[PDB]
Amino acid sequence: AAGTIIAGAELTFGLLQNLLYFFANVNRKCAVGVDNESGFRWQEGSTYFFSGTADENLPYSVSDGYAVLYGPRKTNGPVATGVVGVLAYYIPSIGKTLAVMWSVPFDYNFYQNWWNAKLYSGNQRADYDHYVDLYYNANPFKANGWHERSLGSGLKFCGSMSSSGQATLEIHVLKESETCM
Amino acid sequence: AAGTIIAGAELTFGLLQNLLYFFANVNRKCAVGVDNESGFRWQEGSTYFFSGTADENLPYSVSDGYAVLYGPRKTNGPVATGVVGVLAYYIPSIGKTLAVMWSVPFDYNFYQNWWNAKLYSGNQRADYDHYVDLYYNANPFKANGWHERSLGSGLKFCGSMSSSGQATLEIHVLKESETCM
Amino acid sequence: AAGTIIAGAELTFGLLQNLLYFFANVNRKCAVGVDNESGFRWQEGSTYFFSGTADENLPYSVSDGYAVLYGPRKTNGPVATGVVGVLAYYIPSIGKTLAVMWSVPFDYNFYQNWWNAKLYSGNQRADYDHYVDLYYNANPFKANGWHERSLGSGLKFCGSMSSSGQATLEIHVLKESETCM
Amino acid sequence: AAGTIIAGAELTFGLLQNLLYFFANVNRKCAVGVDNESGFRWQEGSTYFFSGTADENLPYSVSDGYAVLYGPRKTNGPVATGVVGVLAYYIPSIGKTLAVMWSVPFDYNFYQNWWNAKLYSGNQRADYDHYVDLYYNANPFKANGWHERSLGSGLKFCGSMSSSGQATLEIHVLKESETCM
Amino acid sequence: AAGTIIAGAELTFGLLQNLLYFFANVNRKCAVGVDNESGFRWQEGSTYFFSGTADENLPYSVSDGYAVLYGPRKTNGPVATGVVGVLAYYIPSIGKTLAVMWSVPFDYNFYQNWWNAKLYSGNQRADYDHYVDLYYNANPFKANGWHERSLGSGLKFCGSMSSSGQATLEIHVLKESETCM
Amino acid sequence: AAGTIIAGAELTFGLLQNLLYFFANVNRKCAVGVDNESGFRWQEGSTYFFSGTADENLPYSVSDGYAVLYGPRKTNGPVATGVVGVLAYYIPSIGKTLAVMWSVPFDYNFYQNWWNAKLYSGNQRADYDHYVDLYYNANPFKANGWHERSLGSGLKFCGSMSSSGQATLEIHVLKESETCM
Amino acid sequence: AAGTIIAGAELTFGLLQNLLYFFANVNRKCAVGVDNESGFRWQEGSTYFFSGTADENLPYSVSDGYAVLYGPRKTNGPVATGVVGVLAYYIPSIGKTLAVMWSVPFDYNFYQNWWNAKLYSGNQRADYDHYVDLYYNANPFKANGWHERSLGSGLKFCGSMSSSGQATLEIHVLKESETCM
Amino acid sequence: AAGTIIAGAELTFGLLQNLLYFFANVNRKCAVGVDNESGFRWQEGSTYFFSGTADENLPYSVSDGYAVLYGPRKTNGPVATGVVGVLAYYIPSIGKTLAVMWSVPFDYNFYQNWWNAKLYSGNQRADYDHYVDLYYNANPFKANGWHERSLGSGLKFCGSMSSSGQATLEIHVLKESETCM
Amino acid sequence: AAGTIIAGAELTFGLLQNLLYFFANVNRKCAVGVDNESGFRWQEGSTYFFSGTADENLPYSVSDGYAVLYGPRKTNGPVATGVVGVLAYYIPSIGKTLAVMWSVPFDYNFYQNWWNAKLYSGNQRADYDHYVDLYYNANPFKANGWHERSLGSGLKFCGSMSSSGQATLEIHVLKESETCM
């Protein structure tokens, strides 16, 4: 009789409210710090997201001795996806664009935190081709403490990423004749 | 018997209260900053909304070196629509009207955040024709970091919009011989 | 049997308490600012409401360089009607009465926010004929940013109204040789 | 069987507790301000209530340049009646008694806020004949902004009342050669 | 069967707890102020209650230019009776006892607030004969603003009582050649 | 069947918890002030209780110009009895013991607040014979404002007790040539 | 059937939780003050409990003009026993041990608060023989205000104990030529 | 039928949650203070636990005139065991290791608080043989106030332990020619 | 019938929510302090986790007289595993990498807290081979107070670990001619 179906509805929507509340209350976050000590002005700050969003703007420019601070997070409500995105700036003193990438996935059973950076030719704002090149075609870093690499064109970077689901990411971008932190 | 229909009512209005509470508790917001460093007085500040509303007034005028701050939001209660609107000012020193447009939709499965600006001939306050011209007939910007364009008549703008469901929007309006932020 | 009717009463009064609580907890509000910079004394401040009420008094008079601040609201409890009303003052230096009108309706499916002002002959306190003349027989303004008009007799006004369900309204009343805000 | 009557009692007293709580939690209030700038001493301050009560005393006297502040309210608990009352003072310099009256009813479907004042012959403390004379036999003012009238004997008053269910009432009592507020 | 009697007990004690809580949570209070400016010392301060009680003591004496402050209240818990009582002092400079009486009843459907005062021969502390003489055999005042009367023996009083269920009472006792407040 | 007996137990222990909570939450309290201005040292402070208890000690002695403050209360938890007790001191300058007694009963349907004091021969600490002599064989005072009596041996007292269920008690003990408070 | 036994379990453990919570939430406490003004050093401070416990240590020594403060309490959780214990110190200037004893029982239907003190020969730390000698074989004091006795060997004490279930205990230990408090 | 087994599960897990919560919310704690005034440096601070744990480190060393403060506690969650452990230091100026032991058991129906200390030959960090030697083969102290003993090698200690389930333990370690606290 | 299966679901998901909440609310934490007083610069700080995560970065470098502070914790939500990981730095003044390891397991029925450190040849960042070499192939320390060992190459360390489930770990790394803390 229909009393079984009504009790089945109370169980069904009782479980569904808790399942949607669980996916809404799992936090994935990133906090990206990119210190410019490269000796060049950076400008035209741009972004892309494969997943997640940021509430604030970038600085339009980053003069010598100042830092980008920028805080992505997961898409809000019951959607089960993480943060994955790109950041970029153009460096008119050297004719190239710095790009930075990170990932902080939702499902850690198949994925892990990653980051990368490159200095591309000309002016090209962050997009899906920069994501696929920084994440698949280049050699990305995993999130386990400090890594250092040349960008070419007289510049290098040294940086690290936390392995946490709420990840801090830090990069110092600097001249090849200088030492980090 | 009628005891089934009464239990069916308890389930029906129990679900409906939670569904209406969900649509009432989803926030879409915008916060629009338009810095005047154009060297001209702006006046006769006007608006239009295709969806959403603002609680405060605009400034009647914006003298050189001052900013519009203006905060649209969704229509309150269970109505499932976002913020979509236009802002305008008349610039008597150059005989044209600056117009600014944004969108922060409710359903992100089909739509995304956008913005635009133009400098139209004569005096024309914000309306549905300015919305359709800024959103369909012109080339609007998507919400991914800084963009810059000429207005004509000796002016340009540089600005950005957040990809979030609670979006910050920032524009600097300035002379074509000058540099942003 | 009567157990069905008793359970039907529990459902009936359970829904009715929530329906009356909803109509009691929907806020319609107005906040009216009328800055006198007209160069004349205003006195005999009077009002009318087609719907809604105000808790405070008007100032009896408004000397040059001072403002009316006055805050109407909906009728309290489960009554489903908005704010609609008139304000007036007599200006003995010019032999006329300034009148101001606004509307902030309950049902936005059929109505919208409006405002108006006029400078009528002689002394006539606010009433239903001033409401119908300001809302139907004159050309009222809708709530979308700044509008400006002559009153005649050497005076003009410039003002705006918010499109919100809790609406701010602002008017500056000034000499025809002067500029707003 | 008797189980129906017991469930009928749970519904009956469940509704009655909410109905009595509603009539106990509906507020009718008045706040009466009577500024003496008449140039005469007032004394022997007295009152009457047709409905409602005040917790504090009047001042025994009001010298020149001071005000009565006095705050009536409805009778407490589930009783469904408003505030209706009279205030009076004797003015020994002119041989007459000032009387003031107000109403703030419970049922607004049939009644509205009113006020009045008069300057009666000799000494007569506030009573039901002063109420009926100020409310029916004289011409009372309704609660819509400022009204002004002569008392005779060299005095006038100017005053206003709020249309709210919690009403502020203000009167200035002054010489016929002087101007209000 | 006995299940009806058990459900009848749940209803019976459910109603009785709320009825006793209602009679325990209805407040009757008095606050009695008796200013001595009579030019004589008062002493041997004494009291009586027909209903209600006070937590503090009286002053043993009241010298010239000082006041009795004394705060009766209803008997605590579910007992449905008000405040009714007498206060007295002996005045050795004139050979008489000042007595003061008040009432603040529980059931306002049959009773109202009253007060009185007298100056009796010799020394006689407050008792049931002073209550019956001040409330029935003398002419008491009702609680509606200021009243004034001679005590005889060179003294008078002027005083008032609030009509509220929590009543303030004020009396000034003074020489027949002087003016109140 | 046994389901009736189980439901009868839920009612029985549901009522009993509320009945024991009521007797535990009815407060009887006393606060005893005995000002020594007798011109003699008091010492060997002692007590007795027929019902109730005090948490603090007495002072061992009371020199001239100092007061006993001492705060009895009912026995804690569901026990339905009040405060009834004796206080005493020895006065070595006059060879006698001051004793003080009070009562603050639980059941006011049969009993009332009382107090007394005496100055007994020799040294005798407070006990049941001092209680019965101060409460039955002597003439005790009831709790209605100030009373005054000689102790003999050059001393008197003047004092009062509140009629409340939480009673303040005050006594000044002084030379027969002096005046109270 | 077994549904009766399950409902019997809900009643059984529902009552048992409240009974254990009652025995856990009944407080028995003591607070022992022993002022040394004996003119001798005290040392080797030791204790015993027949019931109850203390959280802090004693001072190892008490020089002239200083006091032991020490706060026993009942054993925690549902155990229904009070505080009963002994304190001791050795006095090397006179070759004897001061011992102090108190009781604050759980069941006042059969027992009352007691205290005692003695000055025993040689060095002997507090134990069950000191408890039985101070409580049964010596003459203990009951808790009703100040008592005074010689210790022998040039010393005396004067002290008191509160009759409360949370008892303060105070003793001054002093030379036979001196006066207490 | 299976409805009995389901109701039996509700009772079973309802009782089990409360039983595990009880064993998780019973606190056993120790707080160990070991004052070094021995005139020698202590170093290589080491520990062992038969039950319980400490969150902080020991000091690596204790110079003359400083104290170890160290706070063991029971193992967290529903495990029903107390604190039992050893502490040790090496004293290079005398070629020996000080060891200290305590117990604060869970089940007081069979066990009590104990402590001990010794000065062992050579360097040997705290372990199960030090526990068994300090608790069974040596003569330990019970928790009842101050005890004092020689360590040999020119040193002694004096110390005490509280009998409480949250026990303070204090030891002063000092030269044989000196006096405690 | 299906009513049994629905009641079985209420029990099943009622238990499962509490079981997942228990595994989510059991805390395993570590807090690692590594003081550099080795007289050499440390750089290229790197990590590995066999289980658990850290939210913050390491310092890129540790100059002489400064400390690593670094706080691992368990993986968040219902996953039942502890903290187990490695830390490393390169020391360019001596051509070797310092590595540090710890464990703070979830299941204490089979495992205990451990730590270790080594100074490996060349530059090699922390990984699974450093974990297995520090935990199985080398001789690790258990968490019971201070241990000290040579690193070789002129360096040693002295350090300790807490036995708690929230463990503090401290190491001082120093020249072989110097003394700890």
CATH number at residue B95: 2.60.270.20
Q: What is the DSSP letter of E19?
A: H
Let me know how many helices (H) and strands (E) chain E has, helices first.
Answer: 2, 11
**What residues contact I178, with CB distance under 8 A and at least 6 apart?**
I37
Any domain includes B33: yes
Let me know if chains C and F touch, i.e. at least 3 Cβ pairs under 8 angstroms.
no
Distance, in Å, from the CA atom of F125 to the CA atom of C66, rounded to the nearest integer, reads 81
What are residue H4's phi and psi, to 5 degrees? -65, -45
Closest CA to A45 of B176, B180, B175: B180
Distance, in Å, from the CA atom of C117 to the CA atom of C105, rounded to the nearest integer, reads 18
Residue F44 backbone class (left: φ over 0; alpha: ψ -120 to 50; beta: rest) = left
Closest CA to C176 of C159, C158, C160, C162: C158
Let me know if chains B and A touch, i.e. at least 3 Cβ pairs under 8 angstroms.
yes
Residue type, B100: V
Please calculate the CA angle D167-D168-D172 and round it to the nearest 5 degrees: 145
How are strands ordered across the β-sheet holding B155-161? Answer: B66-70, B29-37, B166-175, B155-161, B147-152
**Torsion on CA atoms G12, G14, G20, G22, rounded to nearest 10:** -130
Any domain includes A75: yes
Helix (H, G, I), strand (E, B) or coil at E58: coil
**What residues contact B118, with CB distance under 8 A and at least 6 apart?**
B98, B99, B133, B134, B138, B151
Entry field: residues in chain F: 181
Helix (H, G, I), strand (E, B) or coil at D95: coil
- Report yes or no: G67 and G36 within 8 Å, Cβ to Cβ: yes
Q: What are the E-state strand segments in H71-146? A: 83-91, 96-104, 114-121, 141-142
Distance, in Å, from the CA atom of D32 to the CA atom of D23, rounded to the nearest integer, reads 24
Strand partners, E26: none
Distance, in Å, from the CA atom of F54 to the CA atom of D169, rounded to the nearest integer, reads 55
Structure token digits, residue A158: 């040294």
Any domain includes G76: yes
H170: nearest CB among G1, G10, G57: G57
**What residues contact B84, with CB distance under 8 A and at least 6 apart?**
B49, B50, B51, B52, B102, B103, B104, B105, B131
Closest CA to D152 of D96, D93, D89: D96
**What residues contact G92, with CB distance under 8 A and at least 6 apart?**
G40, G41, G43
What are residue D30's phi and psi, to 5 degrees? -135, 155
- Window 86-115 of B: residues touching C by CB (8 A cutoff) are none
Closest CA to H132 of H152, H116, H111, H109: H116
Alpha-helical (H) ranges within chain H are: 2-24, 128-132
Residues in chain G within 8 Å Cβ distance of H181: 59-61
SS (H, E, C) chain I: CHHHHHHHHHHHHHHHHHHHHHHHCCCCEEEEEEEEECCCCEEEEEEEEEECECCCCCCCEECCCEEEEECCECCCCCCCCCEEEEEEEEECCCCEEEEEEEEECCCCCCCCCEEEEEEEECCCCCCHHHHHHHHHHCCCEECCECEEEEEECCEEEEEEECCCCEEEEEEEEEECCCCCC
- Gapped junctions in chain A, after residues (C–N > 2.5 Å): none
Residues in chain C within 8 Å Cβ distance of D180: 60-61
Residue B47 backbone class (left: φ over 0; alpha: ψ -120 to 50; beta: rest) = beta
Q: What is the DSSP letter of F136?
A: I
Structure token digits, residue G75: 């054993």
Helix (H, G, I), strand (E, B) or coil at G176: coil
What are residue D125's phi and psi, to 5 degrees? -70, 155
Cβ separation of C10 and D11 shorter than 8 Å?
yes
The DSSP line for E86-154 is: EEEEEETTTTEEEEEEEEE-S-TTT---EEEEEEEES-----HHHHHIIIIIS-PEESSB-EEEEEETT
The DSSP line for A16-47 is: HHHHHHHHHT---EEEEEEEEESSS-EEEEEE
Distance, in Å, from the CA atom of C78 to the CA atom of C23, rounded to the nearest integer, reads 5
Kindly state whether E49 is in contact with chain F, defined as any CB-CB distance less than 8 angstroms: yes
CA nearest to D22 within chain C: C77
Neighbours of B35 (CB within 10 A): 21
Any domain includes C92: yes
Residue type, I19: L
Distance, in Å, from the CA atom of C30 to the CA atom of C38, rounded to the nearest integer, reads 24
Count the domains in chain G. Answer: 1
Closest CA to F76 of B47, C87, G25, C45: G25
Please calculate the CA angle H118-H124-H130 and round it to the nearest 5 degrees: 50
The DSSP line for chain A is: -HHHHHHHHHHHHHHHHHHHHHHHT---EEEEEEEEESSS-EEEEEEEEEE-B-SSPPPSEE-TTEEEEE--BPPSSS----EEEEEEEEETTTTEEEEEEEEE-S-TTT---EEEEEEEES-----HHHHHIIIIIS-PEESSB-EEEEEETTEEEEEEE--SSEEEEEEEEEETTS---
Which range marks the domain in which residue G123 is found?
27-175
Question: From the CA atom positions of chain H, what is the Rg in Å?
Answer: 20
Closest CA to B125 of C172, C149, C138, C146: C146
Q: What is the DSSP letter of F135?
A: I
Neighbours of B85 (CB within 10 A): 26
Cβ separation of D47 and E145 shorter than 8 Å?
yes
Any domain includes H6: no
Residues in chain A within 8 Å Cβ distance of B18: 17
H162: nearest CB among G56, G76, G77: G56
Cβ separation of D4 and C3 shorter than 8 Å?
yes
Distance, in Å, from the CA atom of G138 to the CA atom of E46, rounded to the nearest integer, reads 51
Distance from CA of H100 to the nearest CA of G (A): 18
Distance, in Å, from the CA atom of E43 to the CA atom of E66, rounded to the nearest integer, reads 12
Distance from CA of I3 to the nearest CA of H (A): 9
A55: nearest CB among B148, B162, B170: B162
- Report yes or no: D36 and D173 within 8 Å, Cβ to Cβ: yes
CA distances from A128 to A33, A48, A86, A122, B114 (A): 22, 7, 9, 17, 19
Closest CA to D134 of D152, D155, D148, D120: D120
**What residues contact C165, with CB distance under 8 A and at least 6 apart?**
B53, B76, C27, C28, C29, C104, C108
Q: Chains touching chain D at 3 or more Cβ pairs under 8 angstroms?
A: C, E
Residue type, E6: I
Q: What are the E-state strand segments in G61-135? A: 61-62, 66-70, 83-91, 96-104, 114-121
Distance, in Å, from the CA atom of E17 to the CA atom of E22, rounded to the nearest integer, reads 9
**What residues contact E108, with CB distance under 8 A and at least 6 apart?**
E165
CA distances from H40 to H49, H131, H155, H175 (A): 27, 24, 10, 10
The sign of the torsion formed by the CA atoms of F128, F130, F133, F138 equals negative
Side-chain half-sphere exposure of H85, counting CA atoms within 13 A: 27
Resolution (A): 3.3
Any domain includes F97: yes
- Report yes or no: E61 and E139 within 8 Å, Cβ to Cβ: no
Cβ separation of D48 and E4 shorter than 8 Å?
no
CA nearest to C72 within chain D: D164
Residue G138 backbone class (left: φ over 0; alpha: ψ -120 to 50; beta: rest) = beta
- Report yes or no: H30 and H161 within 8 Å, Cβ to Cβ: no
Distance, in Å, from the CA atom of C73 to the CA atom of C104, rounded to the nearest integer, reads 9
Q: What is the DSSP letter of H135?
A: I
CA distances from E115 to E37, E162, H146 (A): 20, 10, 72
Tokens 């001795």: give the residue.
A65
Helix (H, G, I), strand (E, B) or coil at B35: strand
Cβ separation of F57 and G162 shorter than 8 Å?
yes
- Report yes or no: B168 and B159 within 8 Å, Cβ to Cβ: no
CA nearest to E3 within chain F: F4
Distance, in Å, from the CA atom of F127 to the CA atom of A14, rounded to the nearest integer, reads 69
Strand partners, B88: B46, B99
Residue type, H37: E
Any domain includes C8: no
Distance, in Å, from the CA atom of F107 to the CA atom of F80, rounded to the nearest integer, reads 8
Distance, in Å, from the CA atom of D176 to the CA atom of D148, rounded to the nearest integer, reads 11
Q: How far apart are the first and last CA of chain I?
A: 72
Q: What is the DSSP letter of C135?
A: I
CA distances from E74 to B157, E132, F74 (A): 76, 20, 22
Helix (H, G, I), strand (E, B) or coil at E30: strand
Angle between helix C2-24 and D2-24 (nearest 10): 10
Any domain includes B18: no
What are residue I5's phi and psi, to 5 degrees? -65, -40
CA nearest to H144 within chain G: G47
Distance, in Å, from the CA atom of B126 to the CA atom of B123, rounded to the nearest integer, reads 10
Closest CA to G57 of H167, H34, H106: H167
Closest CA to E23 of E107, E84, E79, E106: E79
